[PDB]
Amino acid sequence: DNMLKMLSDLNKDLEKLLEEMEKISVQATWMAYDMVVMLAESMRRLEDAFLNCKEEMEKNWQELLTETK
Amino acid sequence: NMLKMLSDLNKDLEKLLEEMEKISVQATWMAYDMVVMTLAESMRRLEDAFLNCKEEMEKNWQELLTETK
């Protein structure tokens, strides 16, 4: 049916979200690891940026929960 | 005292990775639970909520790239 078509679309969109988060994960990890091996201030800026991004994502997620409730 | 700074960066990176892990697992089950249990509309709402969330995260990520120079 048009079933395989609908699945296809939910799949691609879920995948795009998962891939976006995958990219952030890998990039954020190397920003941190590169810093500690390659200072006080840059560590502070990066770690505040991590917390800011995490808080924004948590708000994005509450927004999604609302759109789909 | 380098151990303390690392500890703080590790914790904050961890909090970001853990947030994305939670979103990943929850978004995956929202998708899979729908295709097994107004299907058309609910699928549309969810997949567009995924695209919206992915786009917001990409903007959050550009914000971080800017803050960290």
Taking each helix axis from N to C end, the angle separating A40-67 and B39-67, rounded to the nearest 10 degrees, works out to 160
Is A38 strand, coil or helix?
coil
Please report, for residues A24, B3, B4, B38, B63, the alpha-carbon distance to residue B68 in angstroms, rounded to integers and kept in the order given: 14, 22, 21, 45, 9
Cβ within 8 Å, pair A68-B49:
yes
**CA dist., res. B8 & res. A44, Å (int):** 9
A51/B15 CB distance under 8 A: yes
User: B16 lies in which domain range?
Assistant: 1-69
Total of domains in chain B: 1
Q: Which of A12, A17, A20 to mutate to test the interface with B (most CBs of B within 10 A)?
A: A17
Mutation site, B3, B16, B30, B43, interface A, largest A CB count within 10 A: B16
Which of these, A20, A21, A25, A31, lies nearest to B68 by C-alpha position? Answer: A31
Q: How far is CA A61 from the centre of its chain?
A: 11
